[PDB]
Amino acid sequence: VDYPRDLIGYGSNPPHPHWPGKARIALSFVLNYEEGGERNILHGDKESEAFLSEMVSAQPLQGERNMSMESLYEYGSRAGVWRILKLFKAFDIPLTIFAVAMAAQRHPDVIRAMVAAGHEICSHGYRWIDYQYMDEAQEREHMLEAIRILTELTGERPLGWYTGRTGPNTRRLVMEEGGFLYDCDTYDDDLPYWEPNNPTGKPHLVIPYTLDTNDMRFTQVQGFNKGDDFFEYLKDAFDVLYAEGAEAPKMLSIGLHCRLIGRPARLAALQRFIEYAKSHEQVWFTRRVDIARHWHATHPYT
Amino acid sequence: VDYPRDLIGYGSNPPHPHWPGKARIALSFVLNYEEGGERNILHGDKESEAFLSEMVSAQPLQGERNMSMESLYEYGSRAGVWRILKLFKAFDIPLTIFAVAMAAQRHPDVIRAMVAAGHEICSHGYRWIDYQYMDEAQEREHMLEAIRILTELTGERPLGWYTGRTGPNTRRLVMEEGGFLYDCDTYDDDLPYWEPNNPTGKPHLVIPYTLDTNDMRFTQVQGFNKGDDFFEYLKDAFDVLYAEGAEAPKMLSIGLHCRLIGRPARLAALQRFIEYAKSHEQVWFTRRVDIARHWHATHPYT
Amino acid sequence: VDYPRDLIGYGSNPPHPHWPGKARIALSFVLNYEEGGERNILHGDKESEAFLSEMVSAQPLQGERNMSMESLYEYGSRAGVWRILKLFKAFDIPLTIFAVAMAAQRHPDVIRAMVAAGHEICSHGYRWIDYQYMDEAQEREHMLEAIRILTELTGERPLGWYTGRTGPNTRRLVMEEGGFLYDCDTYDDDLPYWEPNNPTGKPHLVIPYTLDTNDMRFTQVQGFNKGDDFFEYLKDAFDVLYAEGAEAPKMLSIGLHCRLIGRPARLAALQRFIEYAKSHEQVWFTRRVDIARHWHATHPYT
């Protein structure tokens, strides 16, 4: 039996990350930019989008446009993004942008704005779709196209990758490409680790992401009712990890979407959490590529 | 590629609305009146209603009456409406009524009461149904009939429109009719804007509405558990926008339904929010047609 | 057009109920007793039960027993019922029991206990099933059997009726039987009213019930997370109605289930609400038949 999953990881002995500034916790705020790259018959897809909107019981419509769904996504690119970017500038916290290439193509000025502000542009795929059933040839073709578009748009190729709705081949293809420093398509640890299955042989860093400390839950069946639920949820995660960080620091990812936390009713809670985190000493507010370069310098692959 | 959606909007430069009384925020409370116009085999539909009731997992019943569903809707027209109207009169806040024409026909006295109180009657369609799949000929026919009924009932034609569950043709037809000042069938901004696609050429104002600061969420899968969740949600939206309004005022819509916020358990939270909003200076409590006339005088279409 | 629904009711002029003791509000606590009468292949049904249990995503199993579901229902009859009955005895608040006849047959001692404590036994149908699709002949036969069983078990025939999941014929059949003082199969008002469609001609009182101030929501998709959500929800309903009751008193129903509020985690909130209600003067804690007899003496049918 050759069991491909690693259920053990670091076991009872996770490594000390030695974060900069003696930090007891590292925080990675991530802003997804997906608006303009989601399912739409305009984009050539077979159906309309149904995932992550105020229309909490929406289903895909075959061969149809869902106008309300489209409008909800437009809030993200029209209004939410600028509000969120302002918030992070006000507290001088850097972002990593999981940017969908097709979305970025449709609003190049906001992407340019993000680059000028010093945020990291990470690849979030060519399209914002589910890759579960896509043939390997086509998924690999999407991947290379995502890199092309983001390189042209930002000026440098992306060094991180996150699909989200992966298939069985996604991560293998990402690591096979050779050019990424890291990917985030796992939810399996509180610390980065070197991928144990990289035949390429080059070191590939895994920086796990999150589906729980993530504003996606505002629109899911099991899901925050009000902003303060998200604040309390983040505060609890922070508290437990910051406590552990007296001896064994870890990291925490906070996932955000323009069309979701960009609504004023939800932004208030994110600000309260940022204020809470800022009120503590020894917190490393950082970007994901910075975590990756740090890991390389601190725990090189052996 | 001719991409029909506007993902950019005002970009990073939204206009100053110069609301009356130097207001830092404009609030539009909206009361939907749908009861008596929803799906029912009595109305000629193929199935019973399932959307927005205490029967949170209800499905449409083909060729059947759902008696419990009917009774829940009746609470709205029998009891909830009068309670809500009293609340708004007590704080002297005007309403815009998204009135469904068939519903209004069935309770002309409550509509007359709303008109005498000075509330704006806006069209919410001929029937409260999903227009996704309706042929353009029939949808346009519905539209003209809605205008006919509301004109006869109120004494003047409606100047605003909101379908809700739109199809691909709805907004185009509304703007094509020529007689509306505005529509609200978008969720894409925090400010009104002139429709960029009106071949008619006449200026048509878009006043975006909301599916999040909306009591509909009390009955949806992702949804407020208690009144205070809705209060906190509205309070957060208000706070963020009122703060921004020190330099760049915006608006906020609060959507209400007779059968939902009309229940005493839920009305309490709406009153607490009204009290909260009233405790602030520089708040414009207004109707949607008043926003439209203001926009015309302040930022005429160029 | 002969529209069978009454969307208007009392309109803007609800009657003053003149509750005993000058009460500003009447409270009707209702305990459902359904355990042992729900769907089960043992009972002859085609499938297992799926409605109102901790197994919130359960579906009916065709031709199968669902052992976990059965066990959850058994908690109600084994443990929850006695805990709830004790609570009400401790505060000397009377109950109306919506008792399912088949359930009562299976635990005659608890029914006898309820009768000795002075609680009203109201009929909740022969079986706890959905009557939407049942033929009129069979539904009427069920009804008469429910009356037979409850009469034998309690010593007197039931004078109230509540099916819950009604079909198009349920209420008509109940009123046709002639022997009931009232039914509760509506959710359409805050006050009792005389049925406008009783060809029998005898006065039949409607005492509306509730799906919102009801512990059923602890197990539904849109649903209280913790006890305090239910407490706050009830407190808000009470507050609004008690306020209105300075000039126009109304009633409020609180619906309970043995297998649900009988759990200690949920009972605490009900006790807090009972304490809250008891802390106010001018509250009529009563049974539904008592409301009906009061209405007869105070607002006889004309």
Place this chain on the structure above:
Amino acid sequence: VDYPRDLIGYGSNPPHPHWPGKARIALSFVLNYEEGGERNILHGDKESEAFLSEMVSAQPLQGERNMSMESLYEYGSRAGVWRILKLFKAFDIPLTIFAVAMAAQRHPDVIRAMVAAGHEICSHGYRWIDYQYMDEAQEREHMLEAIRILTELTGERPLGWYTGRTGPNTRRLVMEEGGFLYDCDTYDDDLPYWEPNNPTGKPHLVIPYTLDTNDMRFTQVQGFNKGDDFFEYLKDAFDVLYAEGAEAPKMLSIGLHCRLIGRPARLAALQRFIEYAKSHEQVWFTRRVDIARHWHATHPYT
């Protein structure tokens, strides 16, 4: 009519458990260890897992691996388990581990760690799957294999059993095997009881478990939004039972999963509850086998 269910139980006269140290309540914290034994085509199943993860609307994928689902489960075995075990060691509270045999085989070191810490290893089945439709021959074969694996791994055979998603034969087979002291596959009481249907004739103890004071609800449609909801829920259950325990002590089960409460955002609430429980005198923090041995000594089967 031979009705197989016991709807009555102890009726109004539950026995006094005489817990050690004069305890007014007995608490059984249970940690499920399922990770590595859930549905997976790697394990020979027909589909991927969908139950109890952050992917709250996940469905099984036929003949496919769901990589995100796998990664979420891996968090449990990689990171959550060690965090949870540390918490319980810090407060010196013993655990009962419902261990799935296939899961234990895949991480023998964590199981050995649990045994050395003095936790009880209880059988949670050979595989973490739904047994509703499994033939009796195959279910019995699974059972014996679970016992084999756990005996080899722990050094002694398991004396308790809990499947969870039982079929109509599960409990009968468990009791037929002869070697268990107890099982927990019911949710029907607040106290242990002797199984009334054990033809074996040997006494078999039932120690009811829970689907409500259970962290599974963090991922279910009806489900805690934030940690504090779970804390309040547990606190309420504790309070009501501790109050009753002045005269009639009972027990309370607290169900936990590595991949769920192991997340820092959720662990905080469990710690707050442990602190709350510890702040009271007369609380028996115990293991399930210890409850069983106590029952044998205190209320032997007659």
